[PDB]
Amino acid sequence: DLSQCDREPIHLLGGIQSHGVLLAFRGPDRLLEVVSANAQALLGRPPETLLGQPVGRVLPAEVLAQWEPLVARGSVRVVLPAGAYRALLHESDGLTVLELEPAELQPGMEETALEVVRRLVSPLAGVKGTQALLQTAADTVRALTGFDRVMVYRFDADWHGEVLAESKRGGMDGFLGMHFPATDIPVQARALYTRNPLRLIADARARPVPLLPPVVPALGRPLDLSNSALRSVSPVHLEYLRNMGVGASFSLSLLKEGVLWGLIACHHLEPLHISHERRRACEVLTQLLALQLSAEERAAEASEDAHRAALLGQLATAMGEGGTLEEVLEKESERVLALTGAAGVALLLGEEPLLVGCTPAQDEVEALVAWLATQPFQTSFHTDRLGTVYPPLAARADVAAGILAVRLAPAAARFAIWFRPEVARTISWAGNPRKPAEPEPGHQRLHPRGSFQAWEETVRDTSLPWKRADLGAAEGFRGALV
Amino acid sequence: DLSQCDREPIHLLGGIQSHGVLLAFRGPDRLLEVVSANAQALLGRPPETLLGQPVGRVLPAEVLAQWEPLVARGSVRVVLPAGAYRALLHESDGLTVLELEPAELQPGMEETALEVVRRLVSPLAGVKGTQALLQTAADTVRALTGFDRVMVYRFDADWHGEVLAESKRGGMDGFLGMHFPATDIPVQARALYTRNPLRLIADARARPVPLLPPVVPALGRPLDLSNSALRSVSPVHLEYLRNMGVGASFSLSLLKEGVLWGLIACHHLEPLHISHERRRACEVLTQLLALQLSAEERAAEASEDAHRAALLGQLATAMGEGGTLEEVLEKESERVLALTGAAGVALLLGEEPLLVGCTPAQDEVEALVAWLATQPFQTSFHTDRLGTVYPPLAARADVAAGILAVRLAPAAARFAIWFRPEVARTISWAGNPRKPAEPEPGHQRLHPRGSFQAWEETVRDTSLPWKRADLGAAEGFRGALV
Ligand SMILES: *C/C=C1/C(=C/C2=NC(=C\c3[nH]c(/C=C4\NC(=O)C(C=C)=C4C)c(C)c3CCC(=O)O)/C(CCC(=O)O)=C2C)NC(=O)[C@H]1C
Ligand SMILES: *C/C=C1/C(=C/C2=NC(=C\c3[nH]c(/C=C4\NC(=O)C(C=C)=C4C)c(C)c3CCC(=O)O)/C(CCC(=O)O)=C2C)NC(=O)[C@H]1C
C-alpha cells in the first residue's frame, strides 16, 4: 500500500552533504546554472555572484586543466589549495553536473584493496557454506572501509529483510539474525538503489546544504540528484539512523542477475568520510560476492536435480520388474516421498485413493481432490499454506500445511498429491513490526519507530517452501506414470 | 609414462634465471647451504666464500633490516644499492629459500590492476558469449603485462590444446584457432603447473645460473625448485621458444574446480621481466575468468536441461491421450528426436523395431540390437564413433557415426537407440602433428619441431559428442517407457 513512505521524492530534495561542492553548467558556454550554497569555501567568491558565469570565469585552472579525461572518464584527482579533491562529472536534466569531494589520502589504498579481492576470489569460497562466503564479504568490506559494523542484508520475496551475516568491532551491539519491515526501505528507494548502487552518508547529524537557485529555472522543480554522490538523503532516514545511534552510514546494492538481492550496510558511531576511490573498491567486492553466490547457487541446484534424477531413475527400474502399481509404490515408499521432500502422498489412480506415508483421512483427501479440479492450474499445483486457500483442512497443519499436486490426465481429476506438515519458525524482528512507523496526529508527519530491540514472533501453519527441484521432480514422476 | 619428454625432472635442473639471486639456509644458525653462482653481483663477495656462514653475516644490512616481516608475510620490498628488489621466502628440502628479484617500478600498478579487474568482474559479462569473456581476459592480461601477444589456451580431453582467443598488438603473427600436440606440454609439466600456477621466462636466450653446490649434500640431488619463482626451465622448451621466435614467455594456469583447464600464455619478442607483484595481479584476473566461466557454463546447462524437460513434459502429455504407443511416437517424432539432438531413433518395444527418421535399414538395426544386448552396460550406452567399436556399421557414417542407447527393461532386449550422422571437422595444427619432435639418431637427444605453419586435417566418421543433457534426457525418456 503506497503510503506516505513511498511517495517522498528523494531525488528532488535539493540538498547536498557539507563535505562536497556541486556545480551544474548549461550550454556551449558552460554557464553556471546551479551551485551549492557552500561553494564559496572552494571558489573564493559568494555563490550568488557566480550564477550565469562561464565555466572559465568560475572554476580554478587546476580543474579546467583536467576537463578532457574528466569528461571521458567521469572522475579525476585535482590538487587545489584546500587540498586533494576528486572531481566527478555526470549529466542530469540537460546540465553537466560537477561534484567535488575530498580525495583518497592513503597511497597504498589500491594495494590493500587488491589483497582483499584475493581473499574474496581465492581457490574456493563457499567451502563450508555460502554462510562462510557472506562472512568473508562482511569481514573484507569492514577491513577496507574501517566501519564499526558491517552487515549483509537479504531481501525476502515481500521486500522485508534479515541480517544474514555481520562483521563488527568488539563491544558493538549487533543485528545478526533479525528481520526488518519492508518499509524501512520504501519502493522509490529500492528503485533508486537498483540504478545507483552506492550511497554514503558522511554525518547523520549534519544539516543539508541547499542548491541555488532552489529550482532549475527551465523546469520549475529541483535538480535531479539521482546520480549525485553528494545527494542528501530523506530526512526520515536521517532520523532512523539517529534512532539506531548511528553517526555515519554506507551501503552497497547487491545486484545478482539484474535484480536487487540485498545490501551490504555499514554503520559507524562517529561521522566518517570514505573517498570515492575507496567506495569503488568496495563496490568491486560486492560485484565479486554476487558472482560467487550465483556460481554456488547454480552448483547447489544442479546437485539437487542430480539427486532427484537418481531417484526417478531408481523408481523407473523398480517398475520394470513386476506389474505392481500399489505393490511397487508401497515398496518404494521412501523414494516416492523423497522425490519432493514430502511426508505423505495420495495417488489417485482412479478407483480408491492410495495413501502412502503420512496423510489426511480418506474422506478429507477426496474433499480436496474434488476441489482441485476446479482450479486454474495447468499440470501442477503447489502451496506452502494450504489452510489459507482451502480451510476444510486448516486444522490439519500437522500433516497438510503444504501440498504439491500434479495432474495425470487432461479432463478428469487423476492426481498424485504430496503433503507437508507445518514447520514452526521463530523470527526476531528489530522492533515491533505492527508499529513500524510513528505518525503524528493527522498522519501527515511520519517518524521512524524508536526501538529496535528484539520482538519475537512464531509462524505457524506453513510448510517448508516447495523448491524448483521439488517441482522438477514432480513433473518427472508425472511423466513416468502416464 | 611414454616419451622421453615426460622423463625430464624439471624441478631438479639446478639452475635459476640471471635477473635474480637464490639463497638457501639450514637450521637454527641459518647457515647458508645452497647459493646461486651469481650471488656476488648482489652481495659484494665471492659466493663460494659464503657457504657455511650464518645468514646474519652473508646478507646485506638492508635485507636484514626487513627480516621479520619477510618471514611473516613471505614477501617484502627492499632497497639495495643495485635497485629495489622483491624478497621471497619458501621452504624446500628442509631449507629456507630466499629469492631476490627486481621489484615493481611503477607506483600506480595496483590502481591500474583494480581498473582491469572491474572490466572483467562487471555485471553483464559474457553477455555476448563466453567467447567474449576469453577475449576480455586476453585483452586485460595483455594491457596489464605489456606483452606483444596474449593467448587463451584450452586443453581437450586428450590433453592436446587449441587457442580459443588471442589479443596481440597490430601486425603480429597469431595462433588463433590452431591446435597443438599434447606433448608440447608433457605430463610432469602439467602436474607441476597445477600446484604452481605462474611461470615467467624473462629471456629465452639467457644461460641459466647454476646453484652451488650442484647437489644438496644431505640428499645427493639438486635442490627442489618446484616453488621457485626463479627456476630456469627445461632446455627443450627454451629451444621451442626460440624456434617460435619468442624472446620472453609468461603463462598462468587456468584452474576450474581443481582441474587444469587451460593456460593464459603470453609471448614477447624481446626479453622482458614482469615484477612479482605484477604477476600476482595477473593471477587475480585468471581466477576471475575461471569463476566467470563456471557460472556461465552452469547457467548454459540449466537452460539446456529446461529445454529437454519441456520436451519430456510435452511427450508425457501426448501420452495419457488418444491411441496406442506407436500412435504418439509419430507426431512427437520431432520431439522424440529432439530429446537428444538426433537424426533418427529405433524403438525395440517388442515386435519388430520401430524406425523413426533417418535410420539405417531394419536388418542392420536388428544386428546392432543383438550385439548391444551383450555389452556391459546397465541402462545407457553411448559413443560418437560407432565404427571404431562396431565395424558392421563403419561404412554408415552418414546416418550412424554416433549412437545413444537406453535399456527399457532388465534381462530383456527392449531398447531406444538414437542415431547421429558424422560431422566433418577441419582441424588446423601448428605444425605437422605426426612429427611433434625431432630426435637425433640414437633417440637420446630430442628437439622441438622446427615449424609451426598451419597443417590441415579433417576428422571424419565422428558425430557431435553426446553431452550431459542428451544423456539426462534419454534417461528421462526411459522412465516414461515404463
Ligand atoms: C516513512 C518511511 C520510512 C523510511 C524511509 C527511507 N529509508 C531509506 C534508506 C535506507 N533504509 C535502510 C534500512 C536499513 N539500514 C540498516 O542497517 C538495516 C538493518 C541492518 C535496515 C533495514 C537503509 C540501509 C537505507 C539506505 C541508506 C543507508 O543508510 O545505507 C530511504 C532512502 C533514503 C535516501 O534518500 O536515499 C527512505 C526514503 N525508513 C523507515 O523506517 C520508514 C519510517
Ligand atoms: C620432448 C619434450 C617437449 C617439450 C617439453 C616441455 N614444454 C614445457 C613448457 C611449455 N610448453 C608450452 C607450449 C605452448 N606455449 C604456447 O604458446 C602454445 C600455444 C600457442 C603451446 C602449446 C608452454 C606454454 C609451456 C610453459 C612455459 C611457458 O613458456 O609459458 C616444459 C616445462 C618447462 C618448464 O621447465 O617449466 C617441457 C619439459 N615441448 C615440446 O615441444 C617437446 C619437444
PDB file of C-alpha atoms in Angstrom, chain B residues 198-336:
ATOM      1  CA  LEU B 198      52.554 -18.877 -12.507  1.00  0.00           C
ATOM      2  CA  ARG B 199      55.739 -19.012 -14.539  1.00  0.00           C
ATOM      3  CA  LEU B 200      57.951 -16.347 -16.109  1.00  0.00           C
ATOM      4  CA  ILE B 201      60.762 -16.915 -18.588  1.00  0.00           C
ATOM      5  CA  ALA B 202      62.364 -13.465 -18.727  1.00  0.00           C
ATOM      6  CA  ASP B 203      64.895 -14.156 -21.515  1.00  0.00           C
ATOM      7  CA  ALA B 204      64.505 -17.258 -23.706  1.00  0.00           C
ATOM      8  CA  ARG B 205      68.126 -16.828 -24.844  1.00  0.00           C
ATOM      9  CA  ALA B 206      69.925 -16.471 -21.490  1.00  0.00           C
ATOM     10  CA  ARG B 207      72.079 -19.138 -19.934  1.00  0.00           C
ATOM     11  CA  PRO B 208      70.943 -20.448 -16.539  1.00  0.00           C
ATOM     12  CA  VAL B 209      72.893 -19.651 -13.381  1.00  0.00           C
ATOM     13  CA  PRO B 210      73.960 -22.843 -11.546  1.00  0.00           C
ATOM     14  CA  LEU B 211      73.396 -23.483  -7.858  1.00  0.00           C
ATOM     15  CA  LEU B 212      76.396 -24.275  -5.622  1.00  0.00           C
ATOM     16  CA  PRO B 213      76.986 -26.932  -4.681  1.00  0.00           C
ATOM     17  CA  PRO B 214      75.211 -28.746  -7.536  1.00  0.00           C
ATOM     18  CA  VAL B 215      73.520 -31.106  -5.039  1.00  0.00           C
ATOM     19  CA  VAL B 216      72.111 -30.678  -1.575  1.00  0.00           C
ATOM     20  CA  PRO B 217      74.790 -32.540   0.423  1.00  0.00           C
ATOM     21  CA  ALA B 218      72.225 -34.317   2.572  1.00  0.00           C
ATOM     22  CA  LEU B 219      70.225 -35.594  -0.397  1.00  0.00           C
ATOM     23  CA  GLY B 220      72.686 -36.248  -3.212  1.00  0.00           C
ATOM     24  CA  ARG B 221      70.477 -34.469  -5.718  1.00  0.00           C
ATOM     25  CA  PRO B 222      69.812 -30.840  -6.570  1.00  0.00           C
ATOM     26  CA  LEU B 223      67.555 -28.518  -4.588  1.00  0.00           C
ATOM     27  CA  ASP B 224      63.852 -28.943  -5.378  1.00  0.00           C
ATOM     28  CA  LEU B 225      62.856 -25.781  -7.259  1.00  0.00           C
ATOM     29  CA  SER B 226      59.167 -26.659  -7.725  1.00  0.00           C
ATOM     30  CA  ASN B 227      58.147 -23.493  -5.865  1.00  0.00           C
ATOM     31  CA  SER B 228      60.970 -21.204  -7.060  1.00  0.00           C
ATOM     32  CA  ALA B 229      59.907 -18.083  -8.938  1.00  0.00           C
ATOM     33  CA  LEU B 230      63.439 -18.024 -10.438  1.00  0.00           C
ATOM     34  CA  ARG B 231      63.526 -21.646 -11.642  1.00  0.00           C
ATOM     35  CA  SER B 232      65.143 -21.911 -15.063  1.00  0.00           C
ATOM     36  CA  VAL B 233      63.062 -24.131 -17.326  1.00  0.00           C
ATOM     37  CA  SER B 234      63.735 -27.277 -19.366  1.00  0.00           C
ATOM     38  CA  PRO B 235      66.239 -26.659 -22.214  1.00  0.00           C
ATOM     39  CA  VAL B 236      63.923 -28.345 -24.751  1.00  0.00           C
ATOM     40  CA  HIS B 237      61.309 -25.679 -24.036  1.00  0.00           C
ATOM     41  CA  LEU B 238      63.762 -22.814 -24.415  1.00  0.00           C
ATOM     42  CA  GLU B 239      64.641 -24.318 -27.793  1.00  0.00           C
ATOM     43  CA  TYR B 240      60.906 -24.499 -28.538  1.00  0.00           C
ATOM     44  CA  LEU B 241      60.500 -20.819 -27.657  1.00  0.00           C
ATOM     45  CA  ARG B 242      63.408 -19.776 -29.860  1.00  0.00           C
ATOM     46  CA  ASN B 243      62.086 -21.869 -32.735  1.00  0.00           C
ATOM     47  CA  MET B 244      58.860 -19.895 -32.319  1.00  0.00           C
ATOM     48  CA  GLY B 245      60.729 -16.586 -32.478  1.00  0.00           C
ATOM     49  CA  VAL B 246      59.798 -15.729 -28.851  1.00  0.00           C
ATOM     50  CA  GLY B 247      62.220 -13.899 -26.548  1.00  0.00           C
ATOM     51  CA  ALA B 248      60.213 -13.906 -23.301  1.00  0.00           C
ATOM     52  CA  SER B 249      57.328 -16.024 -22.073  1.00  0.00           C
ATOM     53  CA  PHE B 250      54.871 -15.931 -19.190  1.00  0.00           C
ATOM     54  CA  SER B 251      51.856 -18.153 -18.663  1.00  0.00           C
ATOM     55  CA  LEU B 252      49.312 -18.748 -15.950  1.00  0.00           C
ATOM     56  CA  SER B 253      47.331 -21.874 -15.153  1.00  0.00           C
ATOM     57  CA  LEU B 254      43.559 -21.766 -15.501  1.00  0.00           C
ATOM     58  CA  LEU B 255      42.131 -23.950 -12.722  1.00  0.00           C
ATOM     59  CA  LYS B 256      38.385 -24.599 -12.859  1.00  0.00           C
ATOM     60  CA  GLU B 257      37.079 -26.587  -9.872  1.00  0.00           C
ATOM     61  CA  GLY B 258      40.502 -28.040  -9.157  1.00  0.00           C
ATOM     62  CA  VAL B 259      41.416 -29.365 -12.622  1.00  0.00           C
ATOM     63  CA  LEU B 260      43.855 -27.920 -15.160  1.00  0.00           C
ATOM     64  CA  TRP B 261      41.553 -26.388 -17.762  1.00  0.00           C
ATOM     65  CA  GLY B 262      43.894 -24.236 -19.819  1.00  0.00           C
ATOM     66  CA  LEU B 263      46.557 -21.559 -19.755  1.00  0.00           C
ATOM     67  CA  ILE B 264      46.867 -17.890 -20.462  1.00  0.00           C
ATOM     68  CA  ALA B 265      50.101 -17.798 -22.460  1.00  0.00           C
ATOM     69  CA  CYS B 266      51.996 -14.578 -23.203  1.00  0.00           C
ATOM     70  CA  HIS B 267      54.900 -14.043 -25.616  1.00  0.00           C
ATOM     71  CA  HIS B 268      57.203 -11.077 -26.040  1.00  0.00           C
ATOM     72  CA  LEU B 269      59.566 -10.684 -28.987  1.00  0.00           C
ATOM     73  CA  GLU B 270      62.311  -9.295 -26.784  1.00  0.00           C
ATOM     74  CA  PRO B 271      63.390 -10.215 -23.246  1.00  0.00           C
ATOM     75  CA  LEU B 272      61.093  -8.779 -20.616  1.00  0.00           C
ATOM     76  CA  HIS B 273      60.698  -9.042 -16.849  1.00  0.00           C
ATOM     77  CA  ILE B 274      57.392  -8.652 -15.006  1.00  0.00           C
ATOM     78  CA  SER B 275      57.674  -7.966 -11.292  1.00  0.00           C
ATOM     79  CA  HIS B 276      56.286 -10.480  -8.822  1.00  0.00           C
ATOM     80  CA  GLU B 277      53.525  -8.145  -7.681  1.00  0.00           C
ATOM     81  CA  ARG B 278      52.509  -7.559 -11.287  1.00  0.00           C
ATOM     82  CA  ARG B 279      52.325 -11.340 -11.854  1.00  0.00           C
ATOM     83  CA  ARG B 280      50.172 -11.802  -8.749  1.00  0.00           C
ATOM     84  CA  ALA B 281      47.860  -9.088 -10.105  1.00  0.00           C
ATOM     85  CA  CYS B 282      47.535 -11.112 -13.315  1.00  0.00           C
ATOM     86  CA  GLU B 283      46.809 -14.182 -11.206  1.00  0.00           C
ATOM     87  CA  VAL B 284      43.777 -12.358  -9.812  1.00  0.00           C
ATOM     88  CA  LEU B 285      42.413 -11.960 -13.357  1.00  0.00           C
ATOM     89  CA  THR B 286      42.718 -15.638 -14.251  1.00  0.00           C
ATOM     90  CA  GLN B 287      40.986 -16.706 -11.057  1.00  0.00           C
ATOM     91  CA  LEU B 288      38.287 -14.218 -12.028  1.00  0.00           C
ATOM     92  CA  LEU B 289      37.945 -15.686 -15.510  1.00  0.00           C
ATOM     93  CA  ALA B 290      37.614 -19.211 -14.153  1.00  0.00           C
ATOM     94  CA  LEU B 291      34.819 -18.041 -11.857  1.00  0.00           C
ATOM     95  CA  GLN B 292      33.056 -16.276 -14.742  1.00  0.00           C
ATOM     96  CA  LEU B 293      33.312 -19.459 -16.830  1.00  0.00           C
ATOM     97  CA  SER B 294      31.862 -21.767 -14.200  1.00  0.00           C
ATOM     98  CA  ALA B 295      28.835 -19.518 -13.671  1.00  0.00           C
ATOM     99  CA  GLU B 296      28.197 -19.134 -17.418  1.00  0.00           C
ATOM    100  CA  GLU B 297      28.668 -22.845 -18.015  1.00  0.00           C
ATOM    101  CA  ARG B 298      26.393 -23.924 -15.207  1.00  0.00           C
ATOM    102  CA  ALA B 299      23.801 -21.422 -16.496  1.00  0.00           C
ATOM    103  CA  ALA B 300      24.066 -22.863 -20.014  1.00  0.00           C
ATOM    104  CA  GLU B 301      23.479 -26.398 -18.675  1.00  0.00           C
ATOM    105  CA  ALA B 302      20.440 -25.305 -16.656  1.00  0.00           C
ATOM    106  CA  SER B 303      18.885 -23.710 -19.732  1.00  0.00           C
ATOM    107  CA  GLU B 304      19.607 -26.887 -21.718  1.00  0.00           C
ATOM    108  CA  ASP B 305      18.025 -29.165 -19.123  1.00  0.00           C
ATOM    109  CA  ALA B 306      14.909 -26.962 -19.026  1.00  0.00           C
ATOM    110  CA  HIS B 307      14.515 -27.208 -22.798  1.00  0.00           C
ATOM    111  CA  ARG B 308      14.754 -31.012 -22.534  1.00  0.00           C
ATOM    112  CA  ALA B 309      12.395 -31.210 -19.550  1.00  0.00           C
ATOM    113  CA  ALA B 310       9.904 -29.167 -21.573  1.00  0.00           C
ATOM    114  CA  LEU B 311      10.138 -31.719 -24.389  1.00  0.00           C
ATOM    115  CA  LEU B 312       9.608 -34.618 -21.930  1.00  0.00           C
ATOM    116  CA  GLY B 313       6.698 -32.757 -20.385  1.00  0.00           C
ATOM    117  CA  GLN B 314       5.130 -32.463 -23.838  1.00  0.00           C
ATOM    118  CA  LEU B 315       5.715 -36.151 -24.588  1.00  0.00           C
ATOM    119  CA  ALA B 316       4.095 -37.010 -21.245  1.00  0.00           C
ATOM    120  CA  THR B 317       1.034 -35.007 -22.281  1.00  0.00           C
ATOM    121  CA  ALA B 318       0.751 -36.697 -25.683  1.00  0.00           C
ATOM    122  CA  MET B 319       0.560 -39.889 -23.659  1.00  0.00           C
ATOM    123  CA  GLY B 320      -2.429 -40.412 -21.466  1.00  0.00           C
ATOM    124  CA  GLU B 321      -4.224 -39.022 -24.524  1.00  0.00           C
ATOM    125  CA  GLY B 322      -5.567 -40.933 -27.509  1.00  0.00           C
ATOM    126  CA  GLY B 323      -4.192 -44.009 -29.193  1.00  0.00           C
ATOM    127  CA  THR B 324      -1.531 -46.638 -28.819  1.00  0.00           C
ATOM    128  CA  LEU B 325       2.190 -46.084 -28.239  1.00  0.00           C
ATOM    129  CA  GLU B 326       3.347 -46.037 -31.861  1.00  0.00           C
ATOM    130  CA  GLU B 327       0.391 -43.660 -32.353  1.00  0.00           C
ATOM    131  CA  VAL B 328       2.110 -40.908 -30.369  1.00  0.00           C
ATOM    132  CA  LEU B 329       5.684 -41.837 -31.268  1.00  0.00           C
ATOM    133  CA  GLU B 330       4.735 -40.370 -34.631  1.00  0.00           C
ATOM    134  CA  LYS B 331       3.684 -36.746 -34.223  1.00  0.00           C
ATOM    135  CA  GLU B 332       6.098 -36.482 -31.341  1.00  0.00           C
ATOM    136  CA  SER B 333       8.618 -37.825 -33.861  1.00  0.00           C
ATOM    137  CA  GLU B 334      10.033 -34.310 -33.921  1.00  0.00           C
ATOM    138  CA  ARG B 335      10.047 -34.200 -30.134  1.00  0.00           C
ATOM    139  CA  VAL B 336      11.406 -37.733 -29.708  1.00  0.00           C
TER     140      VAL B 336
END
